[PDB]
Amino acid sequence: DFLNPKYTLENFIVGEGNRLAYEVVKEALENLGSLYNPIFIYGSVGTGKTHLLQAAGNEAKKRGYRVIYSSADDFAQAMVEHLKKGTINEFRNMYKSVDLLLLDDVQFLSGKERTQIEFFHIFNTLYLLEKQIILASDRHPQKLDGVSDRLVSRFEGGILVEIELDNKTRFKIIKEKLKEFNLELRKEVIDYLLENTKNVREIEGKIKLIKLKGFEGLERKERKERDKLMQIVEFVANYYAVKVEDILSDKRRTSEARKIAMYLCRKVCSASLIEIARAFKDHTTVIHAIRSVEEEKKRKFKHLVGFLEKQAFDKIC
Template sequence: MDASQILTALKNELSQRDFEHYISHLQFSEKQSKADYLVFVAPNEFMAKFIKTKFGEKIAYFYEAKSGNKAKINIISTNNDKLKHHKSTTKLDIVHIKAQSTILNPSFTFDNFVVGDSNKYAFTTCKAASDKDKLGKLYNPIFIYGSTGLGKTHLLQAVGNVCIELGKKVTYATSENFINDFTLHLKNHTLEKFKEKYKNCDALLIDDVQFFGKTDKIQEEFFHIFNEIHNQSGQIIMTSDKPPNMLTGITERLKTRFVNGIIADITPPELDTKKAIIQKKCEFNEIYLRQEVIDYIAASMGNNIREIEGMITNLNAHSKLINQEINLDLVKAVIKDHVKEMKENINFEDILNLVCREFNIKISDVQSNKKMKNIVMVRRIIIFLSRELTSISMPKLATYFDMKDHTAISHNIKKINELINKDLELKNKIDELRNKILVKSQQ
């Protein structure tokens, strides 16, 4: 395939929405491209960065699969600072007009954020705070914390996108952006420009503030920016992987500012929420997955939603390239390396303790030869999950449960498989247990 034809060919590989809203705005730059380096031009910097982030790897993968040549993909913007108009103006264009200096992902909205028990408080707080009459007045500051990949950035940018639609000026930055920006302006003796950039906004959104603990100068500058915005009733929202009191290297006066508002945590999603998230992502990207496939992905992967989204994208690309439906066998083949990597962090004792606690059964009872129905069931579930999620051998399991030999272990696994096929409630319970075990292994 000629590199100049790749965009046209992608029309059949992507959803109509993605192609029309994003890819159709690109132009191939033959002048700037080489055999192993392809350059595409977008109408503005915002769109260039967004397309590169969301579709760069997919374009490279598709080009290599079709042409046999491996190439690095780069997407740049035109030199014209003014936004070029197209036949159809997208929401992406509107965002750029209103906030040319702010890089927000337009797909991060409250509407496509899946709410569950694990994130409900954070979601409700952010949505209420972004109301046009309450911005900077109702909940300020807001401090959201939780592990990587649970949706903190999505919520943060959802607030930003609402603010932009309201005509407000938004400054969004990761802590890395903030630090690099400060360092550059310090080097160029233009700190006043730096201060003006961050202070002159209606909403300041900072991702991963835990990294501010590395430098006293950064904290000093952020402290003053924080105070000035807060005094002017500007909205401040921050995210972190830990609550304020557990942040290392952060000064007490900054911690005091962080806790002087709303603190909301996002915890690993329960199984039903993970299923709903997968379903929502598939709908947004026009990908069809059967319910059994959604159930398997939700139960077999950990709590990092970003990794789950990446897996869905990978499955979709894989399916289209080999012209095969995304069925359970394909999913198991693609996901096996990820599951294998996660297994390395799981041990038999974790499964034993968690399952016994869930069913309120003593470990000594499970280990005994007691034949009571509930104890037998728990014992079988432990055996089933241990064989699936760890490398423990059947002879070792037989020894632990004082069974004759490995054939007894095989019998218990076979029995559970039979029951799962007949009993949906049991299947869901085992899926839920598997999810909790995988989540615990990532903590």
């Protein structure tokens, strides 16, 4: 065993944002490997990829099939010990004799050459034998730099499903979770969890705190420090005429105010990148958006920043 039984088909919630992946996994777990076999699942972190996979193999062991789950960076670490302890073949045949192959976090294949090569062989091998293979990554095939070309066209030749947690999809997931716990559904809670959670981990992370220290316990820790970061409705809106709602959406000098707001949050307010990125969720934007500020600290600028730096101190310190 390396599958946890607490993940299952029913158990997983379905909305138009992970419906297709759900049904590919379910619709295929019937004729195992003989329906449509190379299934690649990909989605943002905490999109439920791991669930979906753990949940497939669980159904297989229950139905009696011979099954392996493994993260790609643990497949590597095994192959690397078996290689050392001169047992690379009982390793291979272990994998070649699965009714279902569940390879998780495929993205960790980059750079590992022989460590890839190895999988390529069990792949074709299980494929040719019409066994069932389910891959899963954080990124689409195309984006796998540092993974051999012959594997990527391999991945694309099957079924690519994306898991894109939209809004209506988060609607359902929050709603169903609150029901799961036996908390009561109410617009206030559902709407907060809507405008404050992007992945399922975040949701359920928060739905447990709700199950633990009420809801009026959330909006203090969660919102208060990020009300100190209402520095947008604060100052940069009032300086060079900016409307809050437009600055919270990347959209052409209207968008030179942003680069300042994020900066003031870092240096004066001491907030973390992640803390700051939750005013915009791609955490590199902030970093070079804050550097370009002093990358352009070279004509009638230096004193403008300082005047505002002194302005936030008075207000907040």
